[PDB]
Design an enzyme around this catalytic site. Sequence first.
Site, PDB file in Angstrom:
ATOM      1  N   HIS A   1      12.179  26.396 -50.258  1.00 25.23           N
ATOM      2  CA  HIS A   1      10.687  25.415 -49.583  1.00 25.23           C
ATOM      3  C   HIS A   1      11.042  25.273 -48.081  1.00 25.23           C
ATOM      4  CE1 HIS A   1      13.339  21.536 -50.672  1.00 25.23           C
ATOM      5  NE2 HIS A   1      12.336  21.593 -49.592  1.00 25.23           N
TER       6      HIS A   1
ATOM      7  N   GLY B   1      14.731  15.767 -44.852  1.00 24.76           N
ATOM      8  CA  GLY B   1      15.384  16.595 -43.924  1.00 24.76           C
ATOM      9  C   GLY B   1      16.367  16.702 -44.541  1.00 24.76           C
TER      10      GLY B   1
ATOM     11  N   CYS C   1      17.353  17.942 -47.753  1.00 28.64           N
ATOM     12  CA  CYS C   1      17.564  19.619 -48.505  1.00 28.64           C
ATOM     13  C   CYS C   1      18.558  20.578 -47.616  1.00 28.64           C
ATOM     14  CB  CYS C   1      16.123  20.357 -48.767  1.00 28.64           C
ATOM     15  SG  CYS C   1      14.623  18.560 -49.479  1.00 28.64           S
TER      16      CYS C   1
HETATM   17  O1  K0G Z   1      11.819  16.324 -52.486  1.00 27.18           O
HETATM   18  C1  K0G Z   1      11.507  16.704 -51.601  1.00 27.18           C
HETATM   19  N1  K0G Z   1      10.524  18.116 -50.865  1.00 27.18           N
HETATM   20  C2  K0G Z   1       9.969  18.472 -51.801  1.00 27.18           C
HETATM   21  C3  K0G Z   1      11.221  19.532 -52.767  1.00 27.18           C
HETATM   22  C4  K0G Z   1      10.462  20.543 -53.463  1.00 27.18           C
HETATM   23  C5  K0G Z   1       8.864  19.851 -53.826  1.00 27.18           C
HETATM   24  C6  K0G Z   1       8.162  18.692 -53.283  1.00 27.18           C
HETATM   25  C7  K0G Z   1       8.818  18.298 -52.737  1.00 27.18           C
HETATM   26  N2  K0G Z   1      12.121  16.067 -50.314  1.00 27.18           N
HETATM   27  C8  K0G Z   1      13.176  15.567 -49.937  1.00 27.18           C
HETATM   28  C9  K0G Z   1      13.205  13.949 -50.191  1.00 27.18           C
HETATM   29  C10 K0G Z   1      14.343  13.351 -50.623  1.00 27.18           C
HETATM   30  C11 K0G Z   1      16.029  13.052 -50.832  1.00 27.18           C
HETATM   31  N3  K0G Z   1      15.699  14.614 -51.723  1.00 27.18           N
HETATM   32  C12 K0G Z   1      14.136  15.643 -51.104  1.00 27.18           C
END
Ligand code: K0G
Lengths: 304, 304
Positions: free
Chosen positions: B41, B143, B145
């Site tokens: 992603h 950030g 990820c």
């Molecule tokens: O989930 C996140 N991005 C995302 C991934 C898949 C679908 C939609 C969005 N970021 C995030 C933010 C805070 C804690 N962990 C991860």
Amino acid sequence: SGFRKMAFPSGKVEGCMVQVTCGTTTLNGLWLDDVVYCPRHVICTSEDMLNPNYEDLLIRKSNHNFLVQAGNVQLRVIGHSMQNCVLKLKVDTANPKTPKYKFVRIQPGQTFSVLACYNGSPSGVYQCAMRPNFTIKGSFLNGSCGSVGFNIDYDCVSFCYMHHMELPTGVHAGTDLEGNFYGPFVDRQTAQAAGTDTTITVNVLAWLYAAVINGDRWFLNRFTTTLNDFNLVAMKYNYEPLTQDHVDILGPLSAQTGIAVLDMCASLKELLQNGMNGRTILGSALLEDEFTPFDVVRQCSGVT
Amino acid sequence: SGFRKMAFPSGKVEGCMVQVTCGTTTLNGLWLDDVVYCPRHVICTSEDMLNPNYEDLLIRKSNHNFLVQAGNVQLRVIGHSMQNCVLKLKVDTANPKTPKYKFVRIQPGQTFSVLACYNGSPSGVYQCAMRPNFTIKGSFLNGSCGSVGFNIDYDCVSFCYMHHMELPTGVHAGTDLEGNFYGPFVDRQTAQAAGTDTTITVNVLAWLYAAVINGDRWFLNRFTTTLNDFNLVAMKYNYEPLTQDHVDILGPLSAQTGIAVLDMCASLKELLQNGMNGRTILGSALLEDEFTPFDVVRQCSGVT
Ligand SMILES: O=C(Nc1ccccc1)Nc1cccnc1
Ligand SMILES: O=C(Nc1ccccc1)Nc1cccnc1
């Protein structure tokens, strides 16, 4: 989102851990520049520990009696001195992995990370607080002495604790890196009792702020209070008095959440008086007091 | 003595963290040998995230579109491929700090350490469990990820998790290092609900053993039970069924303490039925389920 009891990354401290052996006692040392710091009780036979005269025990020890191993390589000891309850062993090699570092003496309620070590080898890392009775509630077996507590400010390791002692109650005592015990403890196998382990109120409030920021809001109530009113209830529940200094330190969390510090105090007051009624806050059934306001901001903001 | 939620020392993993940028998205990568692993992603605009076609998005990306920075030095990307939900970026330099490593896919109830990173820089380390619903309860901001979960066996890092997703409920989802999500989750900004977050019974029992070893014994009762009787009560309390396999795994703790596994089950049964009555076990007001039997033995024995 989410809120975890989080330690500092330990790599910079892993690079400083060595094994110190004096006769048949093996424990851990911290190698910074060309000095290895370790508990002076490395010189004691468990018999010695009952009433040790460290000055007299040290007369019988030479540089070559202190065996320092970094990985599976021996360091040459070219000097040794006692500073309070630590030995400083001068070695002929500066630690090539020495990070930027400070020695700091922390205050009760301050949190730090511990790198638990055995035979100079890291076993784990966990987060601690200096309790108001100057104990810590660690996880330390025999051989863990010389394990250190630290904070990191970007690339500077502030060393604040070296492990020395388990009390008969299985709580822990140690020194700063100048060898001065936290609290009234001494490195002697004698009856030493801890004082009242009070709750670090300012840390509980910080963690209630963390809870609101992470969506745990059920405990927020319709009340406010004053420092004096809060403090009467705090004293009754063996909580530390809250000062205007603590209120000032919680200001950034107040601002972020828009909950006045005294309103959060009144929420905490009702939780003390009412209990949790089987509910949890950030996965805890008790009020957590081992996050400082700085810890909450760091973790809620993502400082590296 | 004492028992702490303990992470593995993080240094070996700190040496593997890099920053990956694709267009305006920055997250973390894991650099092992000459490959950087990161969430696929990284190629999405937050708009893309609503219904991403990753194959189609990837056609628009070249090696030079993936910016990999290790410290403040750029790595040259000489290849890229998608494996399930991770990108593998081939770089021209083998990571000189690559530890001995394995990729393992863990089972629910298994614990691991997370090194939370932002912009390729470690912020903290904490201990997690794979929940029975294949979520983890982490601490992750935007950030974070590409932050990884791992176990260490002496000098071999077993990588088991890479962080991808926060669910609308603020629990976490991610992949193994072959890019396969734990549980039914997908890397798409859509409604995804977690199943029942059941308690990891075998882990609770391990932690009750840790409690006895550390002198917390008040909950030990006069009863025993059977797996079938225990399991009826477990099901009622959203605890995972206990199997003879779990009983076998608790054998060493049974032996050390001389408390039969089924006796400890009957103690756990009374704690479920009676509650804690305002008491604590190892400083907790709830039954901790994020220590495996192996974790308890490791920490109670001092493995490095
Ligand atoms: O989930 C996140 N991005 C995302 C991934 C898949 C679908 C939609 C969005 N970021 C995030 C933010 C805070 C804690 N962990 C991860
Ligand atoms: O306390 C210890 N030695 C000692 C120190 C001073 C007085 C008497 C004995 N070792 C130890 C064991 C377990 C956890 N932490 C420390």
